[PDB]
Symmetry: C3
Subunit: 238 residues, 3 copies
């Protein structure tokens, strides 16, 4: 039901990039046209790690090649060229999300990866060792101690399917389109400051029926992102 | 109804040099104030930089050694005795990037700041938690605030942005009523220390500041009680129980 | 005095570990033997600090003497790699060992040498509490000295304090008797390595602990650090210890 991160994602709100961000109350034109076309908008939680995917039972790391640079052997474009490639020898921390097997020529169980996902109820996250094939064809977020200084306080390197966590009581952006409410920036900012989930998140990525996505980082909202300003993700209420 | 931080604040308990450690003796001024018929409201000490909203602008505190130069617009408000410094306040200087950064950003402003809007952390409607709220700076005019956030003291409170907090906002609960030591109870240093270690609010706070009807205040930092004050040893202020 | 064991030797791993010292799904032979003999197994939280003990009425730090160096004056051997295990009296430079004492600005040492700050279970076994205690109440017992200046305070403790080894009893920790042949019959449960790792990841207490130490009825002890389970230990991956639910 959720989309796949294969190209860059526009911002929910028009934001000027000062080389800081100068956010505005103006929604993305594409998002307005989609909401008026009748697409359902599912707000999901944006995590802070390194973009990956499972492709034919293997983990593939995202790599954006800039103009004129050597395309890595194995790169497969998807959407400043965006694409994915297989892991290299030096990708110690990418392979560390696999479950271990010291009696193997690789030391790894190549068919099992640790993941953080929703438990049987829809109330809390849980670490689970899943078959890597369960994530085939899906984009994931690799997170842990050695990625971004572990701003979520995760206890091990794990993958999280994008769109897993669905945000509760997030501002219904359809109320700012043709408009009942008009302060989309402040309302969203207030949701990240005073909601029960906001403090656990780096931002919000919207998943629509078109396969489109629209994101907002804490930096657009003039907010701080860090392990200090972040509550552990494993303690997030769902 | 809360006091304004204009002069250096005295300690609740007579401290002893070794580092200043609190002992089991209350401040003579606090004894005299409690006997003279004064109310004592324990508030929550937070860790940041002292400021105040004078007129409609934020003012940062600056202390001056009497044998120095007074900056333009500096306004004295008190004077220390131990160090002999001059207490006061200033209008923010160009370089106070993170002081100005507590204002609400404004795409329709020549500087990108709604100079009449600040982000502050205050008590919610019910009074059982703290919320971030964008407010008109005029509502804080005349009051002293503690500016906190990422770039101040290394954000020991785990705040999500630079915000202001009116001094005295967080009224403590179950904090020792320091009239029982002026005597029904004897160990004020043990009970006060036990409160920061084992209360539900202590773990979130840098210390305590008593606000009295006389305008007097008396403070106790964790360092007076021989405790650690750091983000590791502090639970986020925004999830403090009230 | 108290029913918990005294850390005077090295502690073996609950599970047979491989080689980075990672645990496998096989219990220690000594543990299986001890279990089958009918020993009571008490799972207790392992906390990251430094090993000490209250001897006479003084804090003593543990020091392992390598087989190629001299024994310090006042060093007591208590156990046996190739190094001895023993305890010393605190040296004048151990500023942060003495810092778990209650301060006293009127004493020669600046400390109340008869009172130490310790973290223990409160009246009702539902939470941990900091508690000023007469040091003589710990005489003979090994404690875990923890605080800001020990391992960078992965527990987020508001002060250097002592904790009697075995104070925190674990709830819902796998009962390792179901993983051992009972009257020769098949064990009721086969995957200890899996069940344990999921305890540290998804239990209510696991995320607050460095590991687990089983305190058996016969004085033996067995351990598992988060690393044995391929898990991270650090302040960011650890919830404050004083918030651990009991
Ligand atoms: N729920 C989610 N939906 C989409 N992208 C996500 C999600 N959670 C984390 N992300 C990541 O956030 C990135 C977008 O932000 P950025 O890479 O900083 O421009 C994507 O490439 C993803 O790897
Ligand atoms: N609730 C409060 N009441 C009074 N002062 C406070 C409060 N919270 C923080 N402070 C600050 O605490 C400082 C006094 O303690 P110290 O920093 O040890 O001199 C003052 O500069 C105040 O700005
Ligand atoms: N409840 C406990 N029981 C036994 N040892 C403990 C406990 N908590 C912490 N420890 C420490 O764990 C250490 C085990 O060795 P190591 O895991 O190699 O550091 C001992 O030296 C103890 O000081
Ligand atoms: Mg980015
Ligand atoms: Mg100060
Ligand atoms: Mg060891
Ligand atoms: Na990221
Ligand atoms: Na001072
Ligand atoms: Na302060
Ligand atoms: Na200051």
């Amino acid at each position: 039901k959720m989309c796949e991160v294969h190209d860059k994602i526009s911002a929910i709100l028009v934001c000027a990039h000062v080389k800081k961000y100068l956010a505005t109350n103006c929604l993305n034109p594409g998002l307005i046209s989609a909401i008026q076309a009748g697409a359902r908008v599912v707000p999901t939680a944006k995590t802070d790690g390194t973009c990956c995917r499972v492709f034919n039972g293997k983990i593939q790391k995202r790599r954006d090649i800039k103009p004129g640079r050597e395309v890595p052997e194995g790169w497969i474009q998807t959407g400043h060229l965006i694409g994915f490639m297989d892991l290299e020898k030096g990708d110690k921390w990418h392979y560390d999300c696999h479950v271990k097997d010291p009696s193997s020529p690789s030391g790894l169980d190549i068919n099992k990866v640790l993941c953080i996902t929703t438990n049987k109820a829809g109330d809390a996250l849980v670490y689970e060792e899943v078959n890597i094939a369960d994530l085939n064809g899906h984009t994931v977020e690799l997170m842990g101690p050695k990625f971004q200084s572990n701003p979520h306080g995760l206890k091990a390197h794990c993958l999280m399917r994008h769109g897993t966590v669905k945000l509760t009581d997030f501002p219904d952006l359809r109320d700012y389109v043709s408009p009942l409410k008009e302060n989309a920036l402040a309302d969203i900012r207030n949701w990240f400051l005073n909601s029960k989930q906001g403090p656990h998140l780096e931002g919000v990525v919207l998943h629509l029926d078109n396969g489109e996505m629209y994101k907002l980082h804490r930096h657009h909202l003039d907010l701080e992102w860090s392990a200090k300003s972040a509550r552990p993700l494993d303690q997030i209420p769902l």
